[PDB]
Amino acid sequence: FACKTANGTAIPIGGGSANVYVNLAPAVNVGQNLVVDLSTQIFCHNDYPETITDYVTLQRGSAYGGVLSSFSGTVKYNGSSYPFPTTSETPRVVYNSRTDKPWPVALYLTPVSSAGGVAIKAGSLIAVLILRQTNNYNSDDFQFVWNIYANNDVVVPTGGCDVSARDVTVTLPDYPGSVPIPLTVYCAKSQNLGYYLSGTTADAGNSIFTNTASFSPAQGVGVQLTRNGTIIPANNTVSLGAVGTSAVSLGLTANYARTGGQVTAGNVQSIIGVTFVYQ
């Protein structure tokens, strides 16, 4: 019995450990979020299937690691769901072929927010899984330890809802002018959703975001967001109604807005936060 990965390493007869670097594509689902499906990443086979049956379990103590180690969730093993981190060993999966076949493990995360996320840097540890292998022939009892790493920079969603993008950059026409902001949100199941903006503002109305450009800044102008013409102040919750599986645009537009005094030539930049809430 031996196992291999989709990203070029393996563990031979007798077990051992390996570092698995996975290109993550997490997704929200109803009541739990997929962090990683390893059934495309880890494959195992039986070396003498005519005369030996191999038994494979997920061993207790399998858990999230690194920046995810505080999170709990569930693990789907061979079609059934168990609490994760694992407090008890799963039932057995039988391997009875020389053909390498999936280790059927998928890790999920219990939602904690509306639409927030954890930003994961490429190369970060996300989980440690213990594959236990026995057979019906001798007393072999081996551990195949899979250390799961993010291969890519990614955001793991922690909410019931997810967004088309986490980091949006738009370019205004030269002053004066406006530009639409592409940003949509959807939820695994229908949710009553709102959002509010965050940032530093220049005006007594708390609605013109300061020009924080670092090189050759203009003076006298900031950035103001509107929704169909209505100004959005900071820390003022806008309702999106009921948001379901179809993506809903926030309908945001960026504008220049004067902050007082002489307007001078130069660059303009504002960084604005968007945060979702359940209503």
């Binding site: 927010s113 509306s114 639409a115 927030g116 996320g117 909410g159 967004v163 993008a165 986490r166 980091d167 949006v168 950059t169 738009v170 370019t171 205004l172 026409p173 030269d174 002053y175 002018g177 530009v179 902001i181 940003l183 965050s198 975001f209 203009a218 102008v221 950035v223 967001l225 945001l252 960026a254 220049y256 307007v263 001078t264 030539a265 130069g266 660059n267 303009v268 930049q269 504002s270 960084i271 604005i272 936060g273 968007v274 945060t275 979702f276």
Partner: peptide, 13 residues
Amino acid sequence: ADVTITVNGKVVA
């Protein structure tokens, strides 16, 4: 915050 919007612009004399 959940999402960050970076708005870039320019004032020309």
